[PDB]
Design a protein around this motif. Structure first.
Motif, PDB file in Angstrom:
ATOM      1  N   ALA A 145       0.819  -1.205   0.000  1.00  0.00           N
ATOM      2  CA  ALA A 145       0.000   0.000   0.000  1.00  0.00           C
ATOM      3  C   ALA A 145       0.855   1.257   0.000  1.00  0.00           C
ATOM      4  CB  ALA A 145      -0.938  -0.003   1.203  1.00  0.00           C
ATOM      5  N   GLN A 146       2.059   1.182   0.564  1.00  0.00           N
ATOM      6  CA  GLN A 146       2.993   2.296   0.479  1.00  0.00           C
ATOM      7  C   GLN A 146       3.418   2.534  -0.961  1.00  0.00           C
ATOM      8  OE1 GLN A 146       4.390   4.345   2.904  1.00  0.00           O
ATOM      9  NE2 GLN A 146       5.754   5.357   1.451  1.00  0.00           N
ATOM     10  N   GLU A 147       3.634   1.451  -1.707  1.00  0.00           N
ATOM     11  CA  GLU A 147       4.049   1.591  -3.096  1.00  0.00           C
ATOM     12  C   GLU A 147       2.897   2.013  -3.995  1.00  0.00           C
ATOM     13  OE1 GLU A 147       8.141  -0.653  -3.711  1.00  0.00           O
ATOM     14  OE2 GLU A 147       7.090   0.962  -4.764  1.00  0.00           O
ATOM     15  N   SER A 148       1.682   1.575  -3.689  1.00  0.00           N
ATOM     16  CA  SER A 148       0.515   1.895  -4.497  1.00  0.00           C
ATOM     17  C   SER A 148       0.058   3.335  -4.337  1.00  0.00           C
ATOM     18  CB  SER A 148      -0.638   0.955  -4.153  1.00  0.00           C
ATOM     19  OG  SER A 148      -1.189   1.269  -2.888  1.00  0.00           O
ATOM     20  N   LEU A 149       0.615   4.072  -3.382  1.00  0.00           N
ATOM     21  CA  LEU A 149       0.232   5.459  -3.158  1.00  0.00           C
ATOM     22  C   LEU A 149       1.397   6.407  -3.400  1.00  0.00           C
ATOM     23  CD1 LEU A 149      -1.922   4.952   0.025  1.00  0.00           C
ATOM     24  CD2 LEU A 149      -2.710   6.349  -1.857  1.00  0.00           C
ATOM     25  N   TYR A 150       2.619   6.010  -3.044  1.00  0.00           N
ATOM     26  CA  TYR A 150       3.767   6.900  -3.076  1.00  0.00           C
ATOM     27  C   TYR A 150       4.968   6.362  -3.839  1.00  0.00           C
ATOM     28  CZ  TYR A 150       0.905   8.173   0.920  1.00  0.00           C
ATOM     29  OH  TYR A 150      -0.154   8.469   1.742  1.00  0.00           O
ATOM     30  N   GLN A 151       5.069   5.048  -4.048  1.00  0.00           N
ATOM     31  CA  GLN A 151       6.163   4.447  -4.818  1.00  0.00           C
ATOM     32  C   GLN A 151       7.527   4.780  -4.211  1.00  0.00           C
ATOM     33  OE1 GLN A 151       5.164   3.368  -8.618  1.00  0.00           O
ATOM     34  NE2 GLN A 151       6.745   1.855  -8.130  1.00  0.00           N
ATOM     35  N   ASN A 152       7.618   4.741  -2.893  1.00  0.00           N
ATOM     36  CA  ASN A 152       8.915   5.112  -2.344  1.00  0.00           C
ATOM     37  C   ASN A 152       9.424   4.177  -1.260  1.00  0.00           C
ATOM     38  OD1 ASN A 152       8.126   8.365  -3.178  1.00  0.00           O
ATOM     39  ND2 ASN A 152      10.163   7.539  -3.588  1.00  0.00           N
TER      40      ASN A 152
END
Lengths: 164, 109
Positions: free
Chosen positions: B23-30
């Motif tokens: 979910a971190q990658e699906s919103l911010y990609q970082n």
């Protein structure tokens, strides 16, 4: 009032971790190394500390006091000798509480012949609410929690007077 | 933002803690994102706490809400690789003693 109940049974809640080697000379009982009665200091069970994931849903009708601890070893070697995961983390969460803990590995001054530390945390879980423990190391898990009932008119006094 | 008003400015923001790395990658990609918020008196670095929380309001992540008061002539700086809920509307406030907050069900006339 206070009803001490087993939130996490020792014989069923930790099948992948060793719940018998978490004793220290800082808490001696009759000369033998021991630990707290309401807490379990889990360690690796054989060159491995798999991720720990437990939950408790409060089915009691009243508030529950839950206590846990976080261990900070003095050295990285001690961290591996206990948990085998130098980069380890703890996460404790309720509907209002949510906190992530990371070990602070450093050499403190010796008090009670210990260079590491143990921080003790508590929380109150309301009826119908749940608490969740996640870890990859450094968690001293609860064994007994306290269902508590409130009524005014009590207190704590410091006295050397005898009781009759 | 540099405070060109002559009064104190209340500025509010938020920090998001996703439940999972996916979910971190699906919103911010970082993945290893950070936030830094700074005034002349307030400085703080925020790091996400990515973990699964008990569901309240059908959500597993969390939103910590922060606020600050920016003095006249001061500036507030926002820096973020991710997980920042930026301000949109700030409040310039004028203080006059004699007010309050009361809790009542009494009708207003």
């Amino acid at each position: 009032s206070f009803e001490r109940f087993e939130i996490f049974p020792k014989t069923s809640s930790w099948p992948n971790h060793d719940s018998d080697k978490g004793v220290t000379a800082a808490c001696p009982h009759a000369g033998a190394k021991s630990f707290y009665k309401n807490l379990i200091w889990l360690v690796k069970k054989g060159n491995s500390y798999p991720k720990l994931n437990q939950t408790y849903i409060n089915d009691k009708g009243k508030e529950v006091l839950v206590l846990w601890g976080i261990h900070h070893p003095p050295t990285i070697a001690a961290q591996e000798s206990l948990y085998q995961n130098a980069d380890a983390y703890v996460f404790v969460g309720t509907s209002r509480y949510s906190k992530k803990f990371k070990p602070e590995i450093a050499t403190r001054p010796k008090v009670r012949d210990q260079e590491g530390r143990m921080n003790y945390y508590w929380t109150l879980v309301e009826p119908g609410d749940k608490i969740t423990f996640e870890a990859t190391g450094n968690l001293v898990v609860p064994r007994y929690a306290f269902t508590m009932e409130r009524d005014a008119g009590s207190g704590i006094i410091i006295s050397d007077t005898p009781v009759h």
